[PDB]
Amino acid sequence: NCNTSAITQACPKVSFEPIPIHYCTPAGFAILKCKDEGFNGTGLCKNVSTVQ
Amino acid sequence: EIVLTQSPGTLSLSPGERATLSCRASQSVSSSYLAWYQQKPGQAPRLLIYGASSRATGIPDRFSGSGSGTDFTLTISRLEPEDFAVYYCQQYGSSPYTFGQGTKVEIK
Amino acid sequence: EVQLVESGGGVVRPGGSLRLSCAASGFTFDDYGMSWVRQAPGKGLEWVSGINWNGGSTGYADSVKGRFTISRDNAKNSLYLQMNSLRAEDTALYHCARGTDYTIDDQGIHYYGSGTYWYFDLWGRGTLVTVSS
Amino acid sequence: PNNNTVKSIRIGPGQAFYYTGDIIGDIRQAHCNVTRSRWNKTLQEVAEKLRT
Amino acid sequence: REGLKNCSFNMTTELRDKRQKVYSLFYRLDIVPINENQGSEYRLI
Ligand SMILES: *[C@@H]1O[C@H](CO)[C@@H](O[C@@H]2O[C@H](CO)[C@@H](O[C@@H]3O[C@H](CO[C@H]4O[C@H](CO)[C@@H](O)[C@H](O)[C@@H]4O)[C@@H](O)[C@H](O[C@H]4O[C@H](CO)[C@@H](O)[C@H](O)[C@@H]4O)[C@@H]3O)[C@H](O)[C@H]2NC(C)=O)[C@H](O)[C@H]1NC(C)=O
Ligand SMILES: *[C@@H]1O[C@H](CO)[C@@H](O[C@@H]2O[C@H](CO)[C@@H](O)[C@H](O)[C@H]2NC(C)=O)[C@H](O)[C@H]1NC(C)=O
Ligand SMILES: *[C@@H]1O[C@H](CO)[C@@H](O)[C@H](O)[C@H]1NC(C)=O
Ligand SMILES: *[C@@H]1O[C@H](CO)[C@@H](O)[C@H](O)[C@H]1NC(C)=O
């Protein structure tokens, strides 16, 4: 790292284990969710729902 | 002030033999500063080792050495016909820097 | 290309004085300290004196201390030695030698381009100085 | 007028210092030119208004 | 004109154990002399 940047030690007391994060939308906006049994992430989704 | 001494004053080995030289300071050498030089008649001297154990650029693995305190040693893994020469130890550790009496390794 | 060239040698009567000089090329002169080392025929090497890269530090062997002065001109890429009160014992081949390109502090900190006179990786052919009645 | 040659050195991880290593050609003082006729006209007009 | 000076100093390097001599030009206005009265030693203003 010496020719690139200062290097910071991770704190030993702080876990690296992932915790699920929900992402929420502000009022006046909404998240649509595709529920199709199989979906490749593109094109039309026949079965959808709204979630905050 | 500080005087280095060296031994054996003269060595005689056939080519291809392993050989070592000793150098002993009258006072301890700071920070392993002692260094080694090589000379042949009719020529300016060269530096084999800078610091007690680190080779100068262009110095092959054939030359090596180590030491601490007052006692330092130079080692040659095998003598080439080109390696027969007068050798010296110098101390960079304290003013005035001094050169030992040196040793000679010869087949002629 | 890289070389040191000694000049100013000669034969001088005892109690007299002689100035030596050393030309240098093929490397940055300002980055290295330098020394003079002498060798009488049949004898081993003797350190005479040395100077750091800016002339800010000098030292002399006890055998020559107080009779010798060392100085340099970096603009001219040249090293000079002034020898006074010459004695028969001073007869020798004198060599110009390049010092190290770095020096080390009491703290262990290395300074590069701030050369000193500890050890010599480059030597000139040398020049003769003789003292005789 | 000076042709500055700019050089740089790393001074630590992630950092660099810029400096002029040299100047190419003759070293000359920086200067500015103000047209004399326009300036004298300008000062006169300013003086006429200050005078009031 | 003496508007410029050629200065040398020990600048730091990527490693804390090493320093590097640097030559650079500075404007006289950016520099204040250190009163050793030798005229050779300076500091930045
Ligand atoms: C980068 O940094 C290095 C380290 O600072 C510089 O190298 C040093 O350069 C100075 C000269 O500029 C050298 O100084 C000389 O040291 C001599 C020996 O010092 C004695 O005292 C100290 C303690 O103070 C002991 O440690 C040491 O063993 C000695 O016993 C002095 O005798 C010299 O004195 C003369 O010059 C000064 C100049 O101001 C006068 O005031 C005195 O009266 C006297 O005439 C001098 O002080 C120093 O030794 C160097 N250090 C090393 C480790 O070699 C580089 O120059 C610098 N690089 C740049 C570009 O600035
Ligand atoms: C930091 O240091 C590394 C190691 O010296 C540099 O890595 C080299 O980069 C070149 C780029 O062409 C490669 O060809 C080498 O194989 C790399 N060496 C190693 C060991 O991986 C790296 O470039 C440096 N970074 C910077 C910004 O200079
Ligand atoms: C919509 O998707 C959900 C996903 O659990 C599924 O249970 C439901 O039957 C689907 N609706 C239709 C009409 O397919
Ligand atoms: C490291 O620290 C010890 C402390 O006694 C010291 O003797 C040694 O010289 C240091 N090493 C370097 C490379 O500075």
Instruction: Tell me if chain E has a CB within 8 Å of the CB of D13.
Output: yes
What is residue B53's DSSP assignment? T
Partner residues linked to C46 by β-bridges? C38
Q: DSSP labels for chain C?
A: --EEEEE--EEE-TT--EEEEEEEESS-GGG--EEEEEE-TTS--EEEEEE-TTSS-EEE-TTTTTTEEEEEEGGGTEEEEEE-S--GGG-EEEEEEE-EEEEE-TTS-EEEEEEESS--SEE---EEEEE--
Tell me, in Å, the resolution of the deposited structure: 3.3
CA D42 – CA B14 distance, rounded (Å): 99
CB B48 within 8 A of CB B63: yes
Q: Which ligand is nearest to the CA of D13?
A: 2
Instruction: Tell me if chain E has a CB within 8 Å of the CB of C123.
Output: no
Longest dimension (CA), chain C: 50
Tokens of C87: 């004695």
What is residue B1's three-state secondary structure? coil
Name the minimum distance, in Å, from the CA of E17 to any CA of chain C: 5
- Nearest residue on chain A to D9, alpha-carbon basis: A3
Count C/E contacts: CB-CB distance under 8 Å: 23
CB A33 within 8 A of CB A49: yes
Region for residue C74 given its phi and psi (left: phi exceeds 0; alpha: psi -120 to 50; beta: otherwise): alpha
Nearest CA, atom 10, ligand 3 = A47
CB C88 within 8 A of CB C108: no
In this structure, the number of other CB atoms found within 10 A of the CB of residue C78 comes to 17
The Å distance, Cα A3 to ligand 2 centre, comes to 9
Q: Does the beta-carbon distance from D21 to E25 stay under 8 Å?
A: yes
Locate all alpha helices (DSSP H) within D1-52, ordered by sequence.
36-50
CA C99 – CA C80 distance, rounded (Å): 15
* Dihedral pair phi/psi, residue A33, rounded to 5°: -125, 130
Closest CA to B79 of B31, B13, B4: B13
CB E42 within 8 A of CB E31: yes
- How far is C-alpha B11 from the geometric centre of its chain's CA atoms? 13
Longest dimension (CA), chain B: 38
In this structure, the number of other CB atoms found within 10 A of the CB of residue B70 comes to 16
What residue type is C62 in one-letter code?
D
Of D11, D21, D22, which is closest to E12 when you measure between CB atoms?
Answer: D11
CA C7 – CA E2 distance, rounded (Å): 37
